[PDB]
Symmetry: D2
Subunit: 115 residues, 4 copies
């Protein structure tokens, strides 16, 4: 996996399961081309989004459907979703873990980018 | 002031100063209409974006140009910007403070929402 | 005011009010000497803990009673408290704001340190 | 592993490697009995701290030596260390992941507690 997403729940202290994730690549359009999507697993992880071959350098957006997550739990959320937009390179490290820690009125997001 | 943005720098333990912020409102179509913009002051705060009258119910997006901020310090950060998207005033007028704490490869963001 | 504490609630998008805070200073031995205490106001802020004169160089510990806070809301949180331990004034007097954002199983904490 | 520690670096976007971690249990003394310790691995993880048998219910403290970490990197830090103090139970879920995301003037910490 050149790209994976991991989502944590700060209210329950658990992985955030069954969270919808959409990934997009910016076109020469400056519009957002759908690129990959999935639901987080029982461990709050989404793997298998793309391959090294297709994950070329460019700007990518990862959209995490946080509002549907909290609504399904019966908790009132603030944000429509959590978006992470970043340039994916070739020069440096190649595997990207985008992590998000979720609360109803806050979220933190980080990237772990390794060889 | 119904919409304020506060930005902190987690590397230096300081306000994040001169950070560009653009605000947008979603129309009955789904494109983002420009709504307000400004840049953070010496205290890392941006005020005076809007008024109670103008700040009606809707979906808003607050985009904070974190990349130019880090690049000005010589750092190539992970994110292009930090965007915060939320429904506002759907149960009546409220005051919203949108706060972001920034690191080169991470940021956290929280909202304080109060009823005046 | 050289030492202020600000506490936010990430579940409700609000200041964390009536949160107990105890501050301690480490002695030339390694036990923690009580230094100041208070509880956060309606805005989630606690001021007036100390003065420039009294707040000399040393290692300080700010302990925020997050567990009583959550328990008062019916929640059994993960942490017993959140403790923030830091050297202060080692290069001259500064003003320190210690901020904590709280969730039942998580918290973040940051310091804004300024030179008056 | 009933207990593990995972530490992330928010400045470099990597695991925090070679971070010293000390764990303590509160005695009837209200003093802090050393319980386990270790350095984080290349993946920012510390495993093998204890066993289900010895990890009985009680209050535990996890101390992460964040200042030594930043000093070794030549970056000025604010905190002496990051401490996490929590009660470890029997009633509910049994495996504890204590995660910390580190910046020089901030840190976030969460627990993922599962069966
Ligand atoms: O917990 C993990 O497994 C994890 C892995 C990669 C990045 C972050 C991770 N947790 C995490 C912990 C905090 Cl305190 C904040 C964020 Cl954003 C992620
Ligand atoms: O909100 C404030 O006024 C504030 C002031 C100083 C430091 C932090 C502050 N908020 C804050 C915002 C995030 Cl996203 C995380 C944390 Cl720990 C504090
Ligand atoms: Na975002
Ligand atoms: Na702590």
């Amino acid at each position: 996996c050149p790209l994976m997403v991991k989502v944590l729940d700060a209210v329950r202290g658990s992985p955030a399961i069954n969270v919808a994730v959409h990934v997009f690549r910016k076109a020469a359009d400056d519009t957002w081309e759908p690129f990959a999507s999935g639901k987080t697993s029982e461990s709050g992880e989404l793997h298998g989004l793309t391959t090294e071959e297709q994950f070329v350098e460019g700007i990518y957006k990862v959209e995490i459907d946080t509002k549907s997550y909290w609504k399904a739990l019966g908790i009132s959320p603030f944000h429509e979703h959590a978006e992470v937009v970043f340039t994916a390179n070739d020069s440096g490290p190649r595997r990207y873990t985008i992590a998000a820690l979720l609360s109803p009125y806050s979220y933190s997001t980080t990237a772990v980018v390794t060889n």
